Motif scaffolding. Structure first.
Motif, short mmCIF file in Angstrom:
data_model
loop_
_atom_site.label_atom_id
_atom_site.label_comp_id
_atom_site.label_asym_id
_atom_site.label_seq_id
_atom_site.Cartn_x
_atom_site.Cartn_y
_atom_site.Cartn_z
N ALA A 259 40.42 37.20 94.46
CA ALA A 259 39.33 36.57 93.70
C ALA A 259 38.02 37.36 93.80
CB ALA A 259 39.14 35.11 94.09
N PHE A 260 37.71 37.82 95.01
CA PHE A 260 36.44 38.54 95.23
C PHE A 260 36.42 39.85 94.43
CE2 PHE A 260 36.11 36.57 99.79
CZ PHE A 260 35.89 35.31 99.21
N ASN A 261 37.57 40.53 94.35
CA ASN A 261 37.67 41.78 93.61
C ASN A 261 37.53 41.58 92.10
OD1 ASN A 261 38.01 44.01 95.51
ND2 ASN A 261 39.88 42.96 96.13
N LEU A 262 37.83 40.38 91.61
CA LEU A 262 37.80 40.09 90.16
C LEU A 262 36.38 39.85 89.62
CD1 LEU A 262 40.89 37.73 89.68
CD2 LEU A 262 40.60 39.99 88.65
N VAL A 263 35.54 39.19 90.41
CA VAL A 263 34.32 38.58 89.88
C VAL A 263 33.13 39.53 90.07
CG1 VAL A 263 35.17 36.23 90.35
CG2 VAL A 263 33.72 37.38 92.04
N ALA A 264 32.00 39.20 89.43
CA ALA A 264 30.83 40.08 89.45
C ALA A 264 30.27 40.15 90.88
CB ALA A 264 29.76 39.56 88.50
N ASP A 265 29.43 41.16 91.15
CA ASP A 265 28.95 41.40 92.50
C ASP A 265 27.97 40.32 92.95
OD1 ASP A 265 30.51 43.68 92.93
OD2 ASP A 265 28.86 45.08 92.51
N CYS B 298 30.32 40.39 96.86
CA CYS B 298 29.88 41.78 97.03
C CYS B 298 30.40 42.28 98.35
CB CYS B 298 28.34 41.85 97.08
SG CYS B 298 27.67 43.52 97.11
N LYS B 299 31.07 43.43 98.30
CA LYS B 299 31.58 44.03 99.53
C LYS B 299 30.42 44.64 100.30
CE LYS B 299 35.54 46.90 101.01
NZ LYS B 299 36.69 47.75 100.56
N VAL B 300 30.38 44.39 101.60
CA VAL B 300 29.31 44.94 102.45
C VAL B 300 29.92 45.71 103.62
CG1 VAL B 300 27.64 43.18 101.77
CG2 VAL B 300 29.08 42.75 103.78
N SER B 301 29.07 46.33 104.43
CA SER B 301 29.55 47.14 105.55
C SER B 301 30.44 46.32 106.49
CB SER B 301 28.36 47.64 106.36
OG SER B 301 28.83 48.37 107.49
N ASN B 302 31.45 46.98 107.05
CA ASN B 302 32.25 46.32 108.07
C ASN B 302 31.48 46.10 109.38
OD1 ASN B 302 34.52 45.92 106.51
ND2 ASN B 302 35.47 47.89 107.09
#
Ligand code: HEM
Length: 333
Positions: free
Chosen positions: A205-211, A215-219
């Motif tokens: 789901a997270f990969n599909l939708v707008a940032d 939004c992917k952030v630093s590990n």
């Protein structure tokens, strides 16, 4: 089978004093419920009964120390089995800032009492396992537990019959649609139903939708946020769970200390142990409430296990905490 497992556990424990039952079950390639089973006739006793009735009975014992974990994060909370509401679609034991549990009781399978010798002396617990044989929750007596009520509970539910566990294996979307339905939610508790409908994992789901939604952030984000929370003294929520049980800390982060290969929170009634190199993906997500939106940091392992999730503290009717928003904003590229 189980005699050999018991013996081997005694050997491996002596050889690995730093390792616990879950880790030794892992070294043996068996599920932890199988190790509890092997310890019956030694330092474990099988329990039986309606799971809600057992959980309700725990209210009588007073203080306990509860451990809820997954492979990568361990959540320990001192508190009481008060304010139970077990009868709904999912169960809850509602004590914000103390013992705060969310329960998926269809996953709860077996229960054992363990009374064991340790390096710090005798420990007593009641331990719940799921249909896969993984731990759900462990409830330990403390120096403040009502031990008469504890003993009475054990006499009520311990059985001499240690029946076979019968363990079981675990059981392209439209992005515009997923996004529009996410934006249209009016409470975060609708999100799981959304995922279930579209047959998505969280990360899918997270990969599909707008940032602005995910939004992917630093590990390194968890370390950063815990450092900021400790410095700023604002209340946060830390959720750690597994398929059957989620335990939720609410409060100020008093001490953050890396030790023995883990990132730890050492609070007066709460301890977190999180294996930082286990974070494979970290996401900042925004979901609607009835009052606005809230913002979470969500952490995942390589296998897709949700390691932990963080929010700011928030009471129904209030806007998201300002300091928490500011801390999260610092993570966004
Ligand atoms: C009185 C009942 C409950 C209250 C007051 C409550 C409160 C909250 C709060 C404050 C949040 C953080 C997001 C926000 O500020 O809105 C949250 C998130 C969450 N709660 Fe609850 N909750 C309740 C019942 C439940 C139950 C029954 C479950 C499941 C068994 C549950 C599972 C969760 C999960 C998984 C999240 C994170 C949702 C996400 O971001 O995807 N809660 N809850």
């Amino acid at each position: 089978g189980s005699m050999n497992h018991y013996t081997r556990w005694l050997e491996l424990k002596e050889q690995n004093p730093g390792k616990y039952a879950r880790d030794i079950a892992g070294l043996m390639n068996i599920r932890e419920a199988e190790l509890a089973f092997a310890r019956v006739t030694h330092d474990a006793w099988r329990m039986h009964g309606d799971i809600r009735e057992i959980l309700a009975a725990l209210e009588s014992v007073g203080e306990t120390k509860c451990i809820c974990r997954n492979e990568y994060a361990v959540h320990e909370q001192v508190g009481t089995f008060t304010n139970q509401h077990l009868n709904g679609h999912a169960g809850l034991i509602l004590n914000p800032r103390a013992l705060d549990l969310r329960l998926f009781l269809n996953q709860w399978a077996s229960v054992f009492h363990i009374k064991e010798n340790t390096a710090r002396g005798e420990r007593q617990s009641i331990q719940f396992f799921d249909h896969q044989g993984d731990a759900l929750l462990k409830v330990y007596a403390t120096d403040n537990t009502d031990m008469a009520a504890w003993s009475e509970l054990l006499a009520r539910f311990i059985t001499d019959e240690n029946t076979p566990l019968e363990l079981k294996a675990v059981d392209r979307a439209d992005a515009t649609v997923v996004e529009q339905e996410w934006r249209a939610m009016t409470d975060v508790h609708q999100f799981f139903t959304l995922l279930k409908r579209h047959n998505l994992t969280r990360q899918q789901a997270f990969n599909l939708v707008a940032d602005d939604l995910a939004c992917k952030v630093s590990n390194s984000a968890l370390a950063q946020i815990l450092e900021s929370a400790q410095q700023d003294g604002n209340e946060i929520m830390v959720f750690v769970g597994n398929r059957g049980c989620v335990q939720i800390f609410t409060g100020v982060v008093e001490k953050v200390v890396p030790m023995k290969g883990w990132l730890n929170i050492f609070n007066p009634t709460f301890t977190l142990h999180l294996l930082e190199e286990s974070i494979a993906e970290a996401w900042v997500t925004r979901k609607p409430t009835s009052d606005g939106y809230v913002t979470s940091l969500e952490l995942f392992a390589h296998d897709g296990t949700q390691i932990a999730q963080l929010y700011g503290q928030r009471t129904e009717g209030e806007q998201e905490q300002a300091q928490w928003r500011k801390q999260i904003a610092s993570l966004i590229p």
